[PDB]
Nucleic acid binder design. Structure first.
Lengths: 271, 88, 117, 66, 70, 99
RNA sequence: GCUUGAGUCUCGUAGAGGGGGGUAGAAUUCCAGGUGUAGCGGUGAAAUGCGUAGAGAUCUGGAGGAAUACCGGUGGCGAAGGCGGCCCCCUGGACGAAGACUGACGCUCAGGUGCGAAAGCGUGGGGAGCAAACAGGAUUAGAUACCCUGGUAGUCCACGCCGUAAACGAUGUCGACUUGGAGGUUGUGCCCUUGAGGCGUGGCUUCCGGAGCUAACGCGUUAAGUCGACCGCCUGGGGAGUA
């Protein structure tokens, strides 16, 4: 449930925060955690390769299984967890042998729910099937792009994939960007959409909130000198130039896809 | 919508005998059971205004039966509000 | 110069113009003729005489094909259809059977607003 | 006159389509009660059964349609 | 609608039977209603006005047009 | 227990699968609670229009008095099954006898 | 105390009453392909527009969104706004039959609360068709209009706000009484269903008229007649439903 905050400060005045009471308050499951050191946007040469990254809260990587390789054995959802590495919440799931794992949380999910992957399982949300056993018109998430790979598509909060067609060995999906893409019918997909669709409505209020999300300030290139940016320079707010990136490549419309081998999988690109 | 099973189990738990059905405490028990069942109904759907208008009609009808029962004889009225689970 | 015996005539009659198209029965056309294709412009395009002349020009548009008989489908309202199918055998044909294939929605889409004059 | 008042059929059912074929026109449209003399509750039941039969492909929607 | 003109049948017979088919089905009235959007006000007003005209000449047929003029 | 008429059309080549299917659903009904009154198999006959690029579907009718639960999971079983092209469930008043 | 007003229960009925979820068919647009070719579209006439880069026509297929032809009705339901494919789930009311039961529990209602077309606003989607604004072509003395070709918000959905309409039978609610006729719709009883019938009795509704009323027009058992209970409102026109 989203809540707007009382304006007892300006930095409090413009805050909408969303609070989920069903989340688990306490330490996460410790065998599924590992450390996550930060980079600052710096590569192995030590130089900044991605701007506006740095700082933030320390966070630990939760090993969230994307592959869903345990088939046929059912599993009970224990509790939903906060995940600092993700837009979505996660769910601790308990397999019948006694193993515990972290999965993405679908939209309709609760404590004590039973899920299972496999070719045999069900068409309830949370069950993972290969995309020959899923009806056309369904709504999947955590879609693989290769069999056994793990799941690349539709895995942030509120995001899903519609199944449009099935041409034999291939399945034509409609991605969340409006694209049409062909995937092999051999690769797995989880049913439902990803939960936490209320993620869109938080508005962060203040500069410190973006600052502890790990986002450093963004200087406009109009505010620089011409040695720094192609937009820079001028006595008192001159632009006079076409909008470009800091390395002189045209933004505001110029396309930048040059893959040429993944084009056979595309049917209709994003509008 | 108050099946006849439930109307019989109300009327032979609040009534003078089994065929007595129009006594006021029987009617208050009937309207209480239907009000509770519709409190079931309006957890969902939130926007059934016509069903709500029927509900508010039966709420006001129970309130008028209760004010009559208090003005007439309080001895069974206080027993009715202790038993049926309401305040006023 | 491919031959085929029987075909389908489609007379799409609007209020402004009538188009006669003679196809085969698989839908593939053989040639067409309109009420504006020869002369007949404007107010004289909507008349039944224009539709009769359109049928007469589509009759010679299939002289190479040698059509023995054809079923005639009729679409749309307006001063098209009856004069067209009456001139269709007068130019020499055996009309096999007639259908009225005009589209009728089941209240599908909203029509444009009514004109004031 | 109304034959549905004569036999006293309580609910007309879609599973008999001989009478339903009698009560639609050759283009498949339902025939109005002005000419059949059908009494109006049977007219409502008859239209409801004709639409239920159209859904189950025991009757056409239109005569033409491919 | 569907007309199939079978063996031993002339031309203008078939054409008039097709016109009879079109006037039975009323396809041109149902196209002529669907060219422009008549508002539901105009629909209800047309219905009521045609009905009051219909029965208001009908009861005149029934008793007013039954008494002699000359 | 409510009375429901269940009519479905199954595929032409999946007309060979019909009887055990039927008893499976009867195992869904009479195995849970319910009672089959009529089970009248029309067989293959001609549609008025080509549903899903094909004519001539195989019609099955079932009148059954059963609670709502079993017919909920029967409708879910009817949906994702690729053999049936259309299914229609109705709540009637009583149970019926004759064709 | 009583049963006559008001209610409760048993049995049925008819219904676009409501909310949630599916699904079908017709059509418009778009996309891809096949045939084929010089017009299409539009108009009072035109032009803008589209078209030899292959349109319009025509066929096969796909994808979307919206609305549900026929039935369809001076029909129905709802307090009003309003509600129209079909199915299911949840649910409100009205009516009829014969009984039983409580026993005046009633009517109306200032402030109060709730619902309340369309347009509009907020946030998030969706977007076929239509379409304010807008553009272009005309018409014209002019044409920031009507007509044409396009076309954005909007219309659609979810959740909130707005709280207004010629929200109108321009007719507050409830109860009583007072000649008739033709109908419609939905129950129900009796007689021989002796034949697609008759004689009755209930609810709702449509038209025409009698007395009476009314300035007249008209209303007329569903009153604007004859009365009673409570409420709201009016006091010349404009200024002004404005400051």
């Amino acid at each position: 449930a989203v809540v707007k905050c009382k304006p007892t400060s300006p930095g409090r005045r413009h805050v909408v925060k969303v609070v989920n009471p069903e989340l688990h308050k306490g330490k996460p499951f410790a065998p599924l955690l590992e450390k996550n050191s930060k980079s600052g946007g710096r590569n192995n040469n030590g130089r900044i390769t991605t701007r506006h990254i740095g700082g933030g809260h320390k966070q630990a990587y939760r090993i969230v299984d994307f592959k869903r390789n345990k088939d046929g054995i059912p599993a009970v959802v224990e509790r939903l967890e906060y995940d600092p590495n993700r837009s979505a919440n996660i769910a601790l799931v308990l397999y019948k042998d006694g193993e515990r794992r972290y999965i993405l949380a679908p939209k309709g999910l609760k404590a004590g729910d039973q899920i299972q992957s496999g070719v045999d399982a069900a068409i309830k949300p949370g069950n993972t099937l290969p995309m020959r056993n899923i009806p056309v018109g369904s709504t999947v998430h955590n879609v693989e792009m290769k069999p056994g790979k793990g799941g690349q598509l539709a895995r942030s909060a509120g995001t899903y994939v519609q199944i449009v067609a099935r041409d034999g060995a291939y399945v034509t999906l409609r991605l969340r960007s409006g694209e049409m893409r062909k995937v092999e019918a051999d690769c797995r997909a989880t049913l439902g959409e990803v939960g936490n669709a209320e993620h869109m409505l938080r508005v962060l209020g203040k500069a410190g909130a973006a600052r502890w999300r790990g986002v450093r300030p963004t200087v406009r290139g109009t505010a620089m000198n011409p040695v720094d940016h192609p937009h820079g320079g001028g006595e008192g707010r001159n632009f006079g130039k076409h909008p470009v990136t800091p390395w002189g490549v045209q933004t505001k419309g110029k396309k930048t896809r040059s893959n040429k081998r993944t084009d056979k999988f595309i049917v209709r690109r994003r509008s | 919508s108050l099946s006849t099973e439930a109307t019989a189990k109300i009327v032979s738990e609040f009534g003078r005998d089994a065929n007595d059905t129009g006594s006021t405490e029987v009617q208050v028990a009937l309207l209480t059971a239907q009000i509770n069942h519709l409190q079931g109904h309006f957890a969902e759907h939130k926007k059934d205004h016509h069903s709500r208008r029927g509900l508010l009609r039966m709420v006001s009808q129970r309130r008028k039966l209760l004010d009559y029962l208090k003005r007439k004889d309080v001895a069974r009225y206080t027993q009715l509000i202790e038993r049926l689970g309401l305040r006023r | 110069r491919k031959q085929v015996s029987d075909g389908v005539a489609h007379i799409h009659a609007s209020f402004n113009n009538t188009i006669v198209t003679i196809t085969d029965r698989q839908g593939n056309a053989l040639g067409w003729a309109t009420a504006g294709g020869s002369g007949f412009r404007g107010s004289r395009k909507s008349t039944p005489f224009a539709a009769q002349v359109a049928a007469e020009r589509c009759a010679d548009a299939v002289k190479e094909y040698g059509i023995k008989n054809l079923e005639v489908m009729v679409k749309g309202p307006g001063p098209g259809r009856e004069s067209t199918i009456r001139a269709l055998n007068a130019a020499g044909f055996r009309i096999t059977n007639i259908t009225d294939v005009t589209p009728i929605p089941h209240n599908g889409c909203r029509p444009p607003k009514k004109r004031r004059v | 006159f109304c034959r549905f008042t004569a036999e006293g059929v309580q609910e007309i059912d879609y599973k008999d389509i001989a009478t339903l074929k009698n009560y639609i026109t050759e283009s498949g449209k339902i025939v109005p009660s002005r000419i059949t003399g059908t009494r109006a509750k049977y007219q409502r039941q008859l239209a409801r059964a004709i639409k239920r039969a159209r859904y189950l492909s025991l009757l056409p929607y239109t005569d033409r349609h491919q | 609608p569907v007309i199939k003109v079978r063996e031993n049948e002339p031309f203008d017979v078939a054409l008039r039977r097709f016109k009879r088919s079109c006037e039975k089905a009323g396809v041109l009235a149902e196209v002529r209603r669907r060219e422009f959007y008549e508002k539901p006000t105009t629909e209800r007003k047309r219905a009521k006005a045609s009905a009051v005209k219909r029965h208001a000449k009908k009861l005149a047929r029934e008793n007013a047009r039954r008494t002699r003029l000359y | 227990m409510r009375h429901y008429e269940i009519v479905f059309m199954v595929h032409p080549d999946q007309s060979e699968q019909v009887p055990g299917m039927i008893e499976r659903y009867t195992a869904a009904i009479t195995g849970a609670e319910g009672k089959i009154h009529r089970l009248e198999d029309w067989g293959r006959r001609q549609l008025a229009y080509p549903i899903n690029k094909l004519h001539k579907a195989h019609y099955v009718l079932m009148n059954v008095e059963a609670p709502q639960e079993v017919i909920d999971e029967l409708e879910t079983t009817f949906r994702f099954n690729d053999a049936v092209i259309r299914s229609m469930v109705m709540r009637t008043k009583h149970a019926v006898t004759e064709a």
